[PDB]
Each structure stands twice: as C-alpha cells, then as structure tokens.
Amino acid sequence: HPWFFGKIPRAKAEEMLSKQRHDGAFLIRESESAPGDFSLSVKFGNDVQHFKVLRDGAGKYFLWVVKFNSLNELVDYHRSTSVSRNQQIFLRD
Numbered sequence: 664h665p666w667f668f669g670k671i672p673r674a675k676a677e678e679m680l681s682k683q684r685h686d687g688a689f690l691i692r693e694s695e696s697a698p699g700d701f702s703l704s705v706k707f708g709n710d711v712q713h714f715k716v717l718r719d720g721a722g723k724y725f726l727w728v729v730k731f732n733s734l735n736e737l738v739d740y741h742r743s744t745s746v747s748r749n750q751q752i753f754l755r756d
C-alpha cells in the first residue's frame with residue numbers, strides 16, 4: 664500500500680524518515696540483502712529502526728513471536744495491549 668516504497672535503499676529510507684515529524688513514521692521496503700523479503704524502517708525520536716519482516720513455515724508475517732516466560736510477564740504485557748481480538752480490554756483488582 665501507500666507505506667510501501669519498494670526498492671528505496673536503506674540509506675535513503677533513513678534520509679526520508681529522518682525528515683519527518685512524529686515517532687512511528689514508517690515505511691516497508693524490500694530487504695537489502697534478502698530476495699523476496701521485506702524491511703520495516705521506523706522513525707523513532709533520533710534514529711530509524713529497521714525490522715526484518717519475519718515469515719514462518721505457513722507463510723505468515725510477523726515481527727516477533729509474542730510468548731512469555733511467566734504469568735507476570737503475560738499480565739504486564741496485556742496492561743497496555745488488549746487481551747481481546749475484537750474489543751479493547753486491559754486490567755485490575
């Protein structure tokens with residue numbers, strides 16, 4: 664879509680997002696090294712972060728595997744992330 668900028672090099676992607684107002688300004692581009700792969704470049708305060716768009720064996724896309732080592736970690740995550748897939752819900756007594 665409109666966030667998609669195809670073969671824009673990494674450098675010029677950072678050049679571009681660097682001249683943008685707010686944090687979280689982004690685009691997706693083809694990976695510099697990996698044929699058929701995508702990179703997400705995101706303006707965040709003073710730098711540009713680059714993420715590799717991961718794929719699994721079924722061909723789905725993700726940035727990271729969301730799993731936790733404890734119940735505590737799971738609870739702290741979902742105090743700012745919704746527990747529900749279709750409703751916004753957080754946290755408690």
Ligand SMILES: NC(=O)C[C@H]1NC(=O)C2(CCCCC2)NC(=O)[C@H](CC(=O)O)[C@@H](c2ccc(C(C(=O)O)C(=O)O)cc2)/C=C/C[C@@H](Cc2cccc3ccccc23)CNC1=O
Nearest residue numbers: 673693694695696697701702712713714715716717726727
């Ligand atoms: N989605 C993610 O990128 C979560 C990851 N990254 C991080 O935590 C980050 C998050 C932003 C703040 C800095 C640290 N980033 C990084 O580690 C890196 C850091 C970087 O910017 O060099 C990130 C990255 C590497 C290279 C590119 C590059 C390309 O595709 O050739 C490009 O510009 O097109 C883009 C991004 C990816 C590493 C891959 C990852 C290892 C890896 C996984 C799967 C496939 C390959 C394939 C080839 C090499 C490495 C990997 C580790 N990094 C992470 O998993």
Ligand SMILES: NC(=O)C[C@H]1NC(=O)C2(CCCCC2)NC(=O)[C@H](CC(=O)O)[C@@H](c2ccc(C(C(=O)O)C(=O)O)cc2)/C=C/C[C@@H](Cc2cccc3ccccc23)CNC1=O
Nearest residue numbers: 718719720721722723724725729744745746747748749750
């Ligand atoms: N982009 C979205 O937000 C859409 C969905 N995803 C979610 O709600 C999510 C992600 C956002 C945060 C809440 C959990 N994910 C999921 O629901 C899930 C599953 C879940 O329990 O978290 C998502 C999913 C299933 C399977 C894999 C698996 C594989 O594909 O073989 C793998 O590991 O790669 C991965 C993911 C199921 C989708 C079916 C969906 C039901 C469905 C819709 C349309 C067509 C079909 C067709 C067949 C079965 C189900 C559906 C429900 N999930 C969503 O609709």
